[PDB]
Amino acid sequence: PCMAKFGPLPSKWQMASSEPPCVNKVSDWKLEILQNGLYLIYGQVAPNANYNDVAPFEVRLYKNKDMIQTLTNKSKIQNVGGTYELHVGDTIDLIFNSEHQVLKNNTYWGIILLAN
Amino acid sequence: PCMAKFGPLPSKWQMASSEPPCVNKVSDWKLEILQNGLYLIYGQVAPNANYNDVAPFEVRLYKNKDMIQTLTNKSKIQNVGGTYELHVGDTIDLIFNSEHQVLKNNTYWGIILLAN
Amino acid sequence: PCMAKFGPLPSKWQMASSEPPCVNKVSDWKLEILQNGLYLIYGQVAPNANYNDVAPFEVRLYKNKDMIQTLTNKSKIQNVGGTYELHVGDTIDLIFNSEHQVLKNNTYWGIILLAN
Protein backbone atom coordinates (compact mmCIF):
# COMPACT_ATOMS: atom_id res chain seq x y z
CA PRO A 1 0.00 0.00 0.00
CA CYS A 2 0.97 3.65 -0.53
CA MET A 3 -0.19 6.06 2.18
CA ALA A 4 0.73 9.18 4.09
CA LYS A 5 -0.65 11.08 7.03
CA PHE A 6 0.17 14.40 8.59
CA GLY A 7 -0.29 14.68 12.37
CA PRO A 8 -1.73 14.78 14.78
CA LEU A 9 0.93 16.03 17.22
CA PRO A 10 3.48 14.83 18.07
CA SER A 11 3.72 13.52 14.45
CA LYS A 12 4.33 15.53 11.32
CA TRP A 13 4.49 13.68 7.94
CA GLN A 14 4.46 9.89 8.20
CA MET A 15 4.84 7.83 5.01
CA ALA A 16 4.77 4.23 3.81
CA SER A 17 5.11 2.98 0.23
CA SER A 18 7.19 0.91 -2.09
CA GLU A 19 9.74 2.44 -4.46
CA PRO A 20 8.99 4.53 -6.37
CA PRO A 21 6.78 6.41 -3.85
CA CYS A 22 3.31 7.65 -4.86
CA VAL A 23 3.57 10.93 -2.92
CA ASN A 24 6.16 13.17 -1.32
CA LYS A 25 5.81 15.64 1.52
CA VAL A 26 6.28 19.27 0.59
CA SER A 27 5.99 20.88 4.05
CA ASP A 28 3.73 20.71 7.15
CA TRP A 29 0.19 19.78 6.02
CA LYS A 30 1.16 19.78 2.34
CA LEU A 31 1.88 16.90 -0.03
CA GLU A 32 2.69 16.42 -3.70
CA ILE A 33 1.27 13.60 -5.84
CA LEU A 34 3.97 11.60 -7.67
CA GLN A 35 1.75 9.02 -9.40
CA ASN A 36 -1.51 9.26 -11.32
CA GLY A 37 -4.30 7.33 -9.61
CA LEU A 38 -7.40 7.06 -7.50
CA TYR A 39 -6.90 8.30 -3.96
CA LEU A 40 -8.92 8.56 -0.88
CA ILE A 41 -8.22 11.64 1.26
CA TYR A 42 -9.36 11.37 4.88
CA GLY A 43 -8.92 13.03 8.27
CA GLN A 44 -10.57 15.38 10.73
CA VAL A 45 -10.57 18.95 12.00
CA ALA A 46 -11.16 19.22 15.78
CA PRO A 47 -12.10 22.88 16.32
CA ASN A 48 -10.73 24.63 19.39
CA ALA A 49 -13.82 25.33 21.50
CA ASN A 50 -12.39 28.36 23.34
CA TYR A 51 -11.17 30.07 20.17
CA ASN A 52 -11.57 33.80 20.66
CA ASP A 53 -9.42 35.72 18.20
CA VAL A 54 -10.60 38.07 15.47
CA ALA A 55 -9.97 35.76 12.47
CA PRO A 56 -13.24 34.08 11.41
CA PHE A 57 -13.36 30.27 11.67
CA GLU A 58 -12.43 28.45 8.44
CA VAL A 59 -10.28 25.51 7.42
CA ARG A 60 -9.62 24.98 3.72
CA LEU A 61 -8.45 21.94 1.79
CA TYR A 62 -6.63 22.74 -1.42
CA LYS A 63 -6.05 20.77 -4.56
CA ASN A 64 -3.37 22.80 -6.27
CA LYS A 65 -4.68 26.43 -6.10
CA ASP A 66 -8.36 25.52 -5.79
CA MET A 67 -10.22 24.94 -2.57
CA ILE A 68 -11.85 21.51 -2.66
CA GLN A 69 -13.26 21.65 0.87
CA THR A 70 -14.20 24.41 3.30
CA LEU A 71 -14.90 23.66 6.95
CA THR A 72 -16.84 26.42 8.71
CA ASN A 73 -18.19 24.74 11.89
CA LYS A 74 -16.51 25.91 15.16
CA SER A 75 -18.14 23.30 17.43
CA LYS A 76 -18.13 19.76 15.94
CA ILE A 77 -15.31 17.50 14.74
CA GLN A 78 -15.65 17.39 10.95
CA ASN A 79 -14.22 14.97 8.39
CA VAL A 80 -11.87 16.10 5.64
CA GLY A 81 -11.51 14.74 2.12
CA GLY A 82 -13.25 12.34 -0.22
CA THR A 83 -12.33 10.46 -3.36
CA TYR A 84 -10.19 12.12 -5.97
CA GLU A 85 -8.46 11.03 -9.12
CA LEU A 86 -5.15 12.87 -8.85
CA HIS A 87 -2.26 13.54 -11.25
CA VAL A 88 1.51 13.84 -11.14
CA GLY A 89 2.51 17.21 -9.74
CA ASP A 90 -0.78 17.87 -7.92
CA THR A 91 -0.59 19.21 -4.40
CA ILE A 92 -2.97 18.77 -1.49
CA ASP A 93 -2.76 21.21 1.39
CA LEU A 94 -4.76 21.90 4.58
CA ILE A 95 -4.84 25.59 5.60
CA PHE A 96 -6.22 27.08 8.84
CA ASN A 97 -7.43 30.71 9.17
CA SER A 98 -5.52 30.78 12.47
CA GLU A 99 -3.29 28.01 13.87
CA HIS A 100 -5.35 28.29 17.11
CA GLN A 101 -8.79 27.65 15.58
CA VAL A 102 -7.98 23.97 15.77
CA LEU A 103 -6.71 21.26 18.19
CA LYS A 104 -3.58 19.90 16.59
CA ASN A 105 -3.49 16.96 18.99
CA ASN A 106 -6.71 15.72 17.35
CA THR A 107 -6.31 17.23 13.83
CA TYR A 108 -4.79 15.37 10.86
CA TRP A 109 -5.25 14.33 7.25
CA GLY A 110 -3.97 11.47 5.20
CA ILE A 111 -4.21 9.79 1.86
CA ILE A 112 -4.21 6.30 0.45
CA LEU A 113 -3.67 5.10 -3.13
CA LEU A 114 -6.69 2.97 -4.09
CA ALA A 115 -5.87 2.08 -7.68
CA ASN A 116 -4.12 3.04 -10.87
CA PRO B 1 -10.62 -8.63 3.86
CA CYS B 2 -12.21 -7.65 7.19
CA MET B 3 -15.82 -6.47 6.99
CA ALA B 4 -19.13 -6.47 8.79
CA LYS B 5 -22.65 -5.39 8.01
CA PHE B 6 -25.79 -5.10 10.05
CA GLY B 7 -29.09 -5.79 8.25
CA PRO B 8 -31.16 -5.31 6.43
CA LEU B 9 -33.84 -7.75 7.62
CA PRO B 10 -33.83 -10.70 7.79
CA SER B 11 -30.09 -10.33 8.67
CA LYS B 12 -28.62 -8.95 11.86
CA TRP B 13 -24.78 -8.83 12.22
CA GLN B 14 -22.87 -10.58 9.43
CA MET B 15 -19.07 -10.79 9.66
CA ALA B 16 -16.07 -11.96 7.67
CA SER B 17 -12.39 -11.66 8.63
CA SER B 18 -9.27 -13.59 9.39
CA GLU B 19 -8.13 -14.29 12.95
CA PRO B 20 -7.73 -12.13 14.88
CA PRO B 21 -10.90 -10.24 13.82
CA CYS B 22 -10.82 -6.46 13.26
CA VAL B 23 -14.25 -5.84 14.80
CA ASN B 24 -16.80 -7.52 17.04
CA LYS B 25 -20.54 -7.02 17.27
CA VAL B 26 -21.80 -5.51 20.49
CA SER B 27 -25.57 -5.65 19.86
CA ASP B 28 -28.07 -4.82 17.08
CA TRP B 29 -26.68 -1.91 15.01
CA LYS B 30 -23.61 -1.55 17.24
CA LEU B 31 -20.02 -2.68 16.71
CA GLU B 32 -16.70 -2.41 18.52
CA ILE B 33 -13.38 -1.80 16.76
CA LEU B 34 -10.69 -4.36 17.68
CA GLN B 35 -7.85 -3.10 15.46
CA ASN B 36 -6.45 0.35 14.74
CA GLY B 37 -6.83 1.28 11.07
CA LEU B 38 -8.49 3.09 8.22
CA TYR B 39 -12.10 2.09 7.72
CA LEU B 40 -14.84 2.93 5.38
CA ILE B 41 -18.32 3.02 6.93
CA TYR B 42 -21.19 2.71 4.44
CA GLY B 43 -24.91 2.00 4.28
CA GLN B 44 -28.30 3.65 3.88
CA VAL B 45 -31.35 4.83 5.80
CA ALA B 46 -34.64 4.24 3.92
CA PRO B 47 -37.16 6.49 5.72
CA ASN B 48 -40.65 5.15 6.27
CA ALA B 49 -42.84 7.38 4.10
CA ASN B 50 -46.04 6.94 6.15
CA TYR B 51 -44.35 7.69 9.48
CA ASN B 52 -46.86 9.52 11.63
CA ASP B 53 -45.86 9.35 15.28
CA VAL B 54 -44.93 12.26 17.55
CA ALA B 55 -41.14 11.66 17.66
CA PRO B 56 -39.38 13.98 15.19
CA PHE B 57 -37.46 12.31 12.34
CA GLU B 58 -33.75 11.74 13.06
CA VAL B 59 -31.23 8.97 12.65
CA ARG B 60 -27.85 9.35 14.35
CA LEU B 61 -24.53 7.63 13.75
CA TYR B 62 -22.28 7.48 16.79
CA LYS B 63 -18.58 7.11 17.18
CA ASN B 64 -18.25 6.32 20.86
CA LYS B 65 -20.45 8.97 22.59
CA ASP B 66 -20.25 11.56 19.81
CA MET B 67 -22.63 11.84 16.90
CA ILE B 68 -20.67 11.70 13.65
CA GLN B 69 -23.69 11.82 11.35
CA THR B 70 -27.26 13.06 11.64
CA LEU B 71 -29.88 12.15 9.05
CA THR B 72 -32.91 14.46 9.11
CA ASN B 73 -34.63 13.82 5.73
CA LYS B 74 -37.96 11.90 5.96
CA SER B 75 -38.40 11.38 2.20
CA LYS B 76 -35.19 10.27 0.42
CA ILE B 77 -32.89 7.29 0.93
CA GLN B 78 -29.69 8.73 2.42
CA ASN B 79 -26.19 7.27 2.68
CA VAL B 80 -24.50 6.68 6.03
CA GLY B 81 -20.82 6.89 6.90
CA GLY B 82 -17.57 8.02 5.35
CA THR B 83 -13.90 7.41 5.99
CA TYR B 84 -12.63 7.19 9.52
CA GLU B 85 -9.38 6.26 11.16
CA LEU B 86 -10.58 4.21 14.13
CA HIS B 87 -8.92 2.85 17.28
CA VAL B 88 -9.12 -0.20 19.50
CA GLY B 89 -12.14 0.01 21.76
CA ASP B 90 -14.08 2.48 19.58
CA THR B 91 -17.74 1.80 19.00
CA ILE B 92 -19.94 2.68 16.05
CA ASP B 93 -23.69 2.67 16.54
CA LEU B 94 -26.76 3.64 14.46
CA ILE B 95 -29.67 5.02 16.52
CA PHE B 96 -33.21 5.80 15.31
CA ASN B 97 -35.54 8.33 17.04
CA SER B 98 -38.28 5.72 16.60
CA GLU B 99 -37.85 2.17 15.24
CA HIS B 100 -40.72 2.99 12.82
CA GLN B 101 -39.16 6.08 11.20
CA VAL B 102 -37.24 3.70 8.98
CA LEU B 103 -37.70 0.66 6.67
CA LYS B 104 -35.57 -2.06 8.16
CA ASN B 105 -35.90 -4.20 5.05
CA ASN B 106 -33.90 -1.53 3.18
CA THR B 107 -31.83 -0.08 6.08
CA TYR B 108 -28.30 -1.23 6.98
CA TRP B 109 -24.74 -0.16 7.67
CA GLY B 110 -21.42 -1.86 7.31
CA ILE B 111 -17.71 -1.34 7.54
CA ILE B 112 -14.59 -2.45 5.76
CA LEU B 113 -10.95 -2.30 6.87
CA LEU B 114 -9.00 -0.41 4.17
CA ALA B 115 -5.52 -0.36 5.66
CA ASN B 116 -3.38 -0.38 8.75
CA PRO C 1 -9.16 -4.81 -9.75
CA CYS C 2 -12.49 -4.10 -11.47
CA MET C 3 -13.05 -0.48 -12.53
CA ALA C 4 -14.60 1.72 -15.17
CA LYS C 5 -14.61 5.40 -15.97
CA PHE C 6 -16.52 7.51 -18.43
CA GLY C 7 -14.70 10.53 -19.88
CA PRO C 8 -13.50 13.06 -19.84
CA LEU C 9 -13.16 13.84 -23.56
CA PRO C 10 -11.65 12.47 -25.69
CA SER C 11 -12.52 9.22 -23.80
CA LYS C 12 -15.91 7.59 -23.50
CA TRP C 13 -16.21 4.31 -21.48
CA GLN C 14 -12.89 2.82 -20.38
CA MET C 15 -12.90 -0.53 -18.56
CA ALA C 16 -10.54 -2.93 -16.81
CA SER C 17 -11.45 -6.18 -15.04
CA SER C 18 -10.94 -9.89 -15.03
CA GLU C 19 -13.48 -12.29 -16.54
CA PRO C 20 -16.28 -12.28 -15.70
CA PRO C 21 -16.51 -8.44 -15.63
CA CYS C 22 -18.17 -6.66 -12.68
CA VAL C 23 -19.85 -3.99 -14.84
CA ASN C 24 -20.80 -3.32 -18.43
CA LYS C 25 -21.34 -0.04 -20.23
CA VAL C 26 -24.87 0.66 -21.35
CA SER C 27 -24.33 3.96 -23.22
CA ASP C 28 -22.53 7.31 -22.72
CA TRP C 29 -22.43 8.09 -18.97
CA LYS C 30 -24.43 4.98 -18.08
CA LEU C 31 -23.30 1.63 -16.67
CA GLU C 32 -24.88 -1.60 -15.49
CA ILE C 33 -23.72 -3.55 -12.43
CA LEU C 34 -23.00 -7.23 -13.19
CA GLN C 35 -21.81 -8.35 -9.73
CA ASN C 36 -23.13 -7.76 -6.22
CA GLY C 37 -20.62 -5.86 -4.09
CA LEU C 38 -19.29 -2.76 -2.41
CA TYR C 39 -18.39 -0.02 -4.85
CA LEU C 40 -16.96 3.39 -4.68
CA ILE C 41 -18.35 5.85 -7.23
CA TYR C 42 -16.17 8.90 -7.87
CA GLY C 43 -15.70 11.76 -10.32
CA GLN C 44 -16.35 15.45 -10.84
CA VAL C 45 -18.65 17.93 -12.56
CA ALA C 46 -16.82 21.02 -13.90
CA PRO C 47 -19.61 23.55 -14.54
CA ASN C 48 -19.37 25.71 -17.64
CA ALA C 49 -18.86 29.23 -16.28
CA ASN C 50 -20.37 31.06 -19.28
CA TYR C 51 -23.52 28.92 -19.36
CA ASN C 52 -26.37 31.15 -20.45
CA ASP C 53 -29.28 29.08 -21.70
CA VAL C 54 -32.78 28.87 -20.21
CA ALA C 55 -32.47 25.39 -18.61
CA PRO C 56 -31.69 25.74 -14.88
CA PHE C 57 -28.36 24.30 -13.69
CA GLU C 58 -28.58 20.70 -12.40
CA VAL C 59 -26.64 17.49 -12.77
CA ARG C 60 -28.21 14.29 -11.44
CA LEU C 61 -26.69 10.93 -10.55
CA TYR C 62 -29.09 8.02 -10.83
CA LYS C 63 -29.14 4.63 -9.24
CA ASN C 64 -31.74 2.83 -11.31
CA LYS C 65 -34.70 5.31 -11.46
CA ASP C 66 -33.84 7.18 -8.27
CA MET C 67 -31.62 10.21 -8.02
CA ILE C 68 -28.83 9.54 -5.55
CA GLN C 69 -27.04 12.86 -6.06
CA THR C 70 -28.03 16.31 -7.27
CA LEU C 71 -25.42 18.92 -8.14
CA THR C 72 -26.81 22.46 -8.22
CA ASN C 73 -23.69 24.69 -8.04
CA LYS C 74 -22.85 26.56 -11.31
CA SER C 75 -19.46 27.89 -10.18
CA LYS C 76 -17.31 25.28 -8.38
CA ILE C 77 -16.02 21.85 -9.44
CA GLN C 78 -18.01 19.34 -7.37
CA ASN C 79 -17.35 15.68 -6.60
CA VAL C 80 -19.76 12.94 -7.64
CA GLY C 81 -20.54 9.68 -5.88
CA GLY C 82 -19.84 7.95 -2.60
CA THR C 83 -19.96 4.40 -1.31
CA TYR C 84 -22.74 2.12 -2.40
CA GLU C 85 -23.52 -1.54 -2.04
CA LEU C 86 -24.86 -2.39 -5.49
CA HIS C 87 -26.68 -5.38 -6.99
CA VAL C 88 -26.81 -7.28 -10.26
CA GLY C 89 -28.85 -5.37 -12.80
CA ASP C 90 -28.46 -1.96 -11.13
CA THR C 91 -27.66 0.99 -13.33
CA ILE C 92 -25.74 4.16 -12.56
CA ASP C 93 -26.21 7.14 -14.84
CA LEU C 94 -25.08 10.80 -14.88
CA ILE C 95 -27.61 13.20 -16.47
CA PHE C 96 -27.11 16.90 -17.29
CA ASN C 97 -30.00 19.42 -17.59
CA SER C 98 -28.21 20.69 -20.71
CA GLU C 99 -25.09 19.19 -22.33
CA HIS C 100 -23.59 22.73 -22.21
CA GLN C 101 -23.96 23.31 -18.45
CA VAL C 102 -20.75 21.34 -18.04
CA LEU C 103 -17.14 21.12 -19.35
CA LYS C 104 -16.82 17.65 -20.77
CA ASN C 105 -13.05 17.96 -21.01
CA ASN C 106 -12.96 18.07 -17.20
CA THR C 107 -16.14 16.06 -16.39
CA TYR C 108 -16.18 12.30 -15.68
CA TRP C 109 -17.29 9.57 -13.30
CA GLY C 110 -15.99 6.16 -12.51
CA ILE C 111 -16.41 3.21 -10.23
CA ILE C 112 -14.26 0.67 -8.48
CA LEU C 113 -15.20 -2.67 -6.89
CA LEU C 114 -13.99 -2.60 -3.26
CA ALA C 115 -15.20 -5.97 -2.01
CA ASN C 116 -17.71 -8.75 -2.29
From Swiss-Prot, chains A, B, C:
It is a single-pass type II membrane protein. GO terms for cellular component: cell surface; extracellular space; plasma membrane. Its main location: membrane. Residues 1-116 are extracellular. GO terms for biological process: adaptive immune response; cell-cell signaling; negative regulation of apoptotic process; negative regulation of T-helper 17 cell lineage commitment; positive regulation of cell adhesion; positive regulation of inflammatory response; positive regulation of leukocyte migration; positive regulation of macrophage chemotaxis. The keyword ATP-binding does not apply. Glycans are attached at N73, N105. Induction: Up-regulated after stimulation by bacterial lipopolysaccharides (LPS). GO terms for molecular function: cytokine activity; identical protein binding; signaling receptor binding; tumor necrosis factor receptor superfamily binding. Disulfide bonds join C2-C22. Residues 1-114 form the THD domain. The keyword Protein biosynthesis does not apply. Expressed at high levels in the small intestine, ovary, testis, kidney and endothelial cells. It is found in: Cell membrane. Keywords: Adaptive immunity, Cell membrane, Cytokine, Disulfide bond, Glycoprotein, Immunity, Membrane, Signal-anchor, Transmembrane, Transmembrane helix. Belongs to the tumor necrosis factor family. Homodimer. Homotrimer. Cytokine that binds to TNFRSF18/AITR/GITR. Regulates T-cell responses. Can function as costimulator and lower the threshold for T-cell activation and T-cell proliferation. Important for interactions between activated T-lymphocytes and endothelial cells. Mediates activation of NF-kappa-B. Triggers increased phosphorylation of STAT1 and up-regulates expression of VCAM1 and ICAM1. Promotes leukocyte adhesion to endothelial cells. Regulates migration of monocytes from the splenic reservoir to sites of inflammation. This is Tumor necrosis factor ligand superfamily member 18. It comes from Homo sapiens. The chain holds residues 57 to 172 of 177 of the full protein.
